[PDB]
Curated annotation (Swiss-Prot), chain B:
Taxonomic source organism: Escherichia coli O157:H7
Subunit: Monomeric in solution. Homotrimeric; interacts independently with AcrB and TolC as well as AcrZ. Part of the AcrA-AcrB-TolC efflux pump.
Family: Belongs to the membrane fusion protein (MFP) (TC 8.A.1) family.
Protein name as annotated: Multidrug efflux pump subunit AcrA
Localization, UniProt: Cell inner membrane
Function: AcrA-AcrB-AcrZ-TolC is a drug efflux protein complex with broad substrate specificity that uses the proton motive force to export substrates. This subunit may act as an adapter protein that links AcrB and TolC stably together.
Length: 53, 41
């Protein structure tokens, strides 16, 4: 009923310490990925996530 | 020697080329700042 709760499981094979919020879906079909993208803002004060993964 | 036969006539056919391509908006322009300066918000 709401948008949007994203989960994570990081390369360790474990889910990130907590989930994250899916912000939206930009409907533009990415030309060379031919792929929609989802930008989900996540809290990362634990200084764990890093820009890009 | 008896056989089912369908006589041939001229049958109009409106089927035509099926050819693809990429899709795009109209309605898909961009946003370019015309004023240099910091991004405030």
């Amino acid at each position: 009923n709401g948008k949007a709760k994203v989960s994570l499981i990081t390369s360790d094979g474990i889910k990130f310490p907590q989930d994250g919020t899916l912000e939206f879906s930009d409907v533009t079909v990415d030309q060379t990925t031919g792929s929609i993208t989802l930008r989900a803002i996540f809290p990362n004060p634990d200084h764990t996530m890093m820009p890009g993964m | 020697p008896a056989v089912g036969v369908v006589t041939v006539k001229t049958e109009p056919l409106q089927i035509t080329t099926e050819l693809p391509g990429r899709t795009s908006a109209y309605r898909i322009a961009e946003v370019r700042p015309q004023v240099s300066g910091i991004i405030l918000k």
